[PDB]
A paper describes a structure:
Dominantly inherited mutation D395G in the gene encoding valosin-containing protein causes vacuolar tauopathy, a type of behavioural-variant frontotemporal dementia, with marked vacuolation and abundant filamentous tau inclusions made of all six brain isoforms. We used cryo-EM to determine the structures of tau filaments extracted from the frontal and temporal cortices of the individual with vacuolar tauopathy. The ordered cores of the filaments span residues K274-R379 of three-repeat tau and S305-R379 of four-repeat tau. The CTE tau fold differs from the Alzheimer fold by having a more open conformation of the β-helix region, which contains an internal density of unknown identity.
Three types of filaments were observed that were made of two identical protofilaments arranged in different ways. Filament structures were determined to resolutions ranging from 2.3 to 3.4 Å, which allowed us to establish their identity as CTE filament Types I-III. All three filament types were found in the frontal cortex, with Type III being absent from the temporal cortex. The three types of filaments are molecular polymorphs consisting of two identical protofilaments that are linked in different ways. By cryo-EM, the tau fold was identical to that in CTE, SSPE and ALS/PDC. This is the first inherited tauopathy with the CTE fold.
Residue numbers in the entry:
A (entry chain C), B (entry chain A), C (entry chain E), D (entry chain G), E (entry chain I), F (entry chain H), ...: 305 to 379
């Protein structure tokens, strides 16, 4: 009675070509940071951060991506 | 009675070509930061951040992307 | 009785070509930041940020994108 | 009784070509920022930000995009 | 009565080519950080961080990715 | 008695081919100069120069030279 | 009696081919100079230079030279 | 009596081929100079230079030279 | 009586091929200089140089030389 | 009586092939110099140099030389 046929075909290509990648320079919090405090009161949770935190330099030669979902559902 | 046939065909291409990529320079919080406080009162949660935080330099040679959903659903 | 046939064909191309990409310069919060406070009162949650935060330099050689949905649904 | 046939064909191309891309310069919050406060009262949630935040330099060599939906629905 | 056939075919390729990748420089918290405190009171959990923390330099030669889900579900 | 004959032939070519030439940035400049002088004596001619002088940026697309001397001399 | 014959032939070629040339950055510059002088004496001509002088950035696409001398001399 | 014959032939080629040339950064510069002088005496000509002088950045795409002398001499 | 014949032949080639040339960084520079002088005496010509002088960055894509002398001499 | 014949033949080739050339970093530089002098005497010409002088970065893609002398001499 029923025939289902699921024949997707994919010959795709995600591509990149880069002769030369360079001279990157990241210089966060190069300056001066000063914190003075007097007579502070805290009745609840404190988080502090002070300085140069969480600084990223992310230099992929590629960095190319592909996402592909397939789904076939039946009642 | 029923025939379903699902034959998508994809020969696509997401492509890039870059001779030379360079001389990038990121210089956040180069200046001076000063914080003075007197007689502060807190009855609830504090989060602080002070300085140069979360600074990103993201330099993919590629950075090319493709997303493809397929779905086939039946009652 | 029923025949469904789903044969999309795609030979597309998203493409770019860039001889030379450079001399980028990002210089946030280069100046001076001063915060003085006296006799502050807080009865509820505080978030602060002070300085140079969350600054991005995003330089993809490619940066090309393609999105493609396919859906075939039946009652 | 019924025949449905879904044969879209796509030979499209989204394309760009750029000899040289450069000399970009982003200089936010170069000046001076001063905040003085006396006798402030807060009965509810505070968010502050002070300085140079969230500044983006986004320089894709490509930056070309294509979106394509296909849908075929039946009762 | 029922025949289901699930024959997706994939000949895809996510690719990159990079002649030379270099001269990367990450210099967070190069400046000076000073914290003075007098007469602080805490009635709840404290987290502090002070200095240069969590700074990443991530330089993959490749960095190319592919994700592919397949699902076939029946009642 | 004497026969002198000078028949040089030249079919040369100096050639160049450059797709794209970009992104030069020269800064012979920015800095400070101070000169203080007390009780100086000069008994012969003086030349001075003070500041940013004679600084060049020379970006020829071609920039190809060809120099050819011919000489024929008789006594 | 005498026969002199000078028949040079040249079919040479000096050639160059460069897809893309980019991203130069010269900074002969930035810094500070100070000169103080007291009770100096000069009995003959003086030349001075003080600052940023005679600094070049030379970026020819071609930049190919060819030099050819010919000489024929008789006594 | 005398027969002299000079028939040089040259079909040479000086050639270069460079896909992509990038990302130069010269900094002959930044630093500090100080000169103090007291009770100096000069009885003959003086030349001085002080600062950033005669500094070159030379980036030819080709940069190919060919030099050829010919000489024919008779007494 | 005398017959002299000079028939050099040259079909040479000086060649180079370089896919991608990148990422140079020269810093002849940064540092401090101080010169103090008291009670010096000069009875003949003086030359001085003080700072960053005559510093080169030479990045030819080709950079191929070929030098050829010819000489024919008779007495 | 005399017959002299000079028929050199050259079909040579000086060749180079380099896929990718990268990532040079020269720092002839950074450091401190101090010179103090008291009661010096010079009765003949003086030359001085003080700082960062005559420093080279030479990165030819090719950089191939070929030198050829020819000489034919008669008395």
């Amino acid at each position: 009675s029923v025939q289902i046929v699921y024949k997707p075909v994919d010959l795709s290509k995600v591509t990149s070509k880069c002769g030369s990648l360079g001279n990157i320079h990241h210089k966060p919090g190069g300056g001066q940071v000063e914190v003075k405090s007097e007579k502070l009161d805290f009745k609840d949770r404190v988080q502090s951060k002070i300085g140069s935190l969480d600084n990223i330099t992310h230099v992929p030669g590629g960095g190319n991506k592909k996402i592909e979902t397939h789904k076939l559902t039946f009642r």
